[PDB]
Write a protein that binds this DNA or RNA. Structure first.
Ligand SMILES: [K+]
Ligand SMILES: [Mg+2]
Length: 425
DNA sequence: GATAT
RNA sequence: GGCCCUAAACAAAGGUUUAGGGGUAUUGUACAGGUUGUGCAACACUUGGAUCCACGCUACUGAUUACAUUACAUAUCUAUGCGGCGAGGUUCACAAUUUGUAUGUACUGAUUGUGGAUGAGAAGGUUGGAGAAAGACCACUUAGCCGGAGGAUGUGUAGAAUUGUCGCUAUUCUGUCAUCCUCCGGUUUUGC
């Protein structure tokens, strides 16, 4: 068989409770609804992604940093092929309801639009440019994937497929994705005696089925979502279900913005309203009142309101608007400062590791009577300078080309000499 | 490998 | 202890409890069973040509049958750019001669062959194993940025820059020029 006829099939790289399968067995298995009705779903494996925000106070320069935790849960190989196949089925029915309601340009994330974040941010900044004096209201949903109510998700799933109730294979998948069960990966590796430093060594699955049934389940390692809300982040079906859940609210928010002569955009849980200035104080309370039917809440700490006025002939914002990795002040478009900061930390760690490897092999050349060598820097230039083809600078120059910004080019210009000075440091 | 959530 | 199957009990719910069983890597050969023709063929489906013939092709079923071979998500960009040349040796363990001896044996240096490892374009540490050695394997670990203003100093449409090195490409820069110092402002804007 050929993968090109079956776009849902992807081979995945992690270890789980079962082994990777071939295209022939996946295609024969997932196409039978009786197999889906009789399937034995394995638990998800789970861990937390760690993130830090550092924010010194600008009055007295005191340290403050906050740890942020994102719970992540990923499914087994055969389960991941079942979810990908049914997400492929649900996407075609979802896109027809997108085209019916003219929502094609409002809903941005997780759709195969052949567009990136640069084009979405460019479209938002061109709307403010055409609209003139206006306000941008930015809203964020609080705990989006963890707070989806299961009955609302079931009702939205029946409308997309167009039935009164879910069929049996769809209902089995809905049961597995809502009342899900998960096993903590570190506890499983501790109990089974698997090294956290090298797990794929002389094994192709985490354990035997006897070892699963005796050591995993009887030790209490399976934790079941018995609350009435939440779906796991890390399944192949979850992002589509997050788009399906929000559809009627997207229709209502497009109508609300269009009544007032404005525009509406949503990228996952990130929402942008571009409205005339007289509505900008009411808007967050109107959106907080109409989203209570979805049982999800706005994160009121993350609300940002910006205002654009003409100063001379140039449109000027009172503070710059951040949107999808870019900064816009009314005329100029810049990259986020945190993306350039992240590039700087990655570059410095790479150069420091290259110097450590240089020192390590120079000791060996001294021991065996060979002449010392300098720093090899093909890989450093491929990773961290413009000669590379798949790095941060190709993204930056691509963004400077698309958005027509000399300011992005002036941001990217000192990065060559900083890499050279870090090498000479 | 790079970007957005 | 979630999930699936079987059986029972209470009843009729997209049910609860008890008891027992289970978790399909890959590619083939046997073996076992269905549906059917007249013991031993035949088996699926999209599609084409005139029920029949043919192409594509998951080829009646087998995880619950044997045997054997082979080895974090979604969307987007792109797939450490490609190709020559370094390389003579060094090290470790055996084996065969000969180098100096004692009595073929017991030592000792060097030449000659076979096998492990290694230079090559940066994946770091440890008195930790294994090992004949290994640069390999196993075990345990590993304020910053952006915008603006003032200065001080240098400098100028073809040329410059970029990997151990060369070639073919490719990308970036070129007076709102570069490095460094000072001041002001921003950073709900960092997915292990
Ligand atoms: K080369
Ligand atoms: Mg926001």
């Amino acid at each position: 068989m050929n993968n090109d006829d079956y776009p849902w099939f992807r081979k995945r790289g992690y270890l789980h409770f079962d082994e990777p399968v071939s295209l022939k067995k996946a295609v024969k298995y997932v196409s039978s609804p009786e197999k889906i009705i009789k399937h034995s779903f394995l638990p998800f494996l789970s861990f937390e992604v760690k993130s830090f925000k550092i924010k010194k106070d600008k009055s007295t320069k005191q340290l403050s940093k906050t740890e942020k935790l994102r719970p992540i849960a990923y499914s087994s190989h055969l389960d991941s092929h079942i979810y990908a196949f049914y997400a492929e089925y649900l996407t075609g029915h979802y896109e027809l309801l997108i085209q019916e309601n003219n929502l094609h340009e409002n809903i941005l994330a997780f759709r195969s639009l052949n567009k990136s974040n640069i084009e979405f941010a460019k479209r938002a900044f061109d709307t403010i440019t055409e609209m003139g004096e206006c306000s941008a209201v930015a809203l964020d949903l609080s705990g989006f994937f963890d707070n989806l109510d299961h009955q609302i998700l079931k009702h939205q799933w029946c409308k997309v497929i167009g039935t009164e109730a879910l069929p049996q294979d769809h209902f089995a998948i809905y049961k597995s994705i809502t009342r899900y069960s998960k096993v903590d990966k570190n506890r499983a590796y501790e109990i089974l005696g698997i090294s956290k430093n090298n797990p794929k060594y002389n094994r192709r699955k985490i354990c035997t089925p006897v070892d699963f049934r005796n050591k995993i389940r009887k030790n209490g390692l399976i934790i079941v979502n018995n609350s009435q809300k939440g779906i796991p982040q890390g399944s192949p079906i979850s992002a589509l279900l997050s788009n399906i859940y929000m559809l009627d609210f997207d229709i209502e928010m497009r109508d609300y913005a269009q009544e007032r002569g404005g525009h509406y955009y949503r990228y996952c849980d990130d929402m942008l309203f571009i409205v005339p200035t007289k509505y900008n104080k009411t808007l967050a309370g109107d959106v907080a009142q109409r989203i209570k039917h979805l049982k999800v809440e706005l994160n009121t700490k993350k609300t940002e309101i910006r205002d654009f006025i003409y100063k001379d002939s140039t449109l000027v914002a009172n503070m710059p608007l951040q949107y999808l990795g870019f900064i816009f002040d009314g005329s100029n478009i810049l990259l986020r400062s945190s993306s350039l900061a992240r590039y700087s930390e990655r570059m410095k760690r790479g150069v420091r590791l290259a110097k450590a490897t240089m020192d390590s092999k120079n000791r060996i050349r001294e021991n065996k009577g060979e002449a010392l060598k300098a720093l090899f820097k093909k890989k450093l230039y491929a990773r961290y300078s413009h000669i590379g083809r798949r790095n941060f600078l190709t993204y930056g120059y691509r963004a400077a080309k698309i958005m027509n910004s000399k300011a992005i080019k002036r941001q990217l210009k000192p990065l060559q000499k900083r890499l050279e000075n870090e090498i000479l440091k």
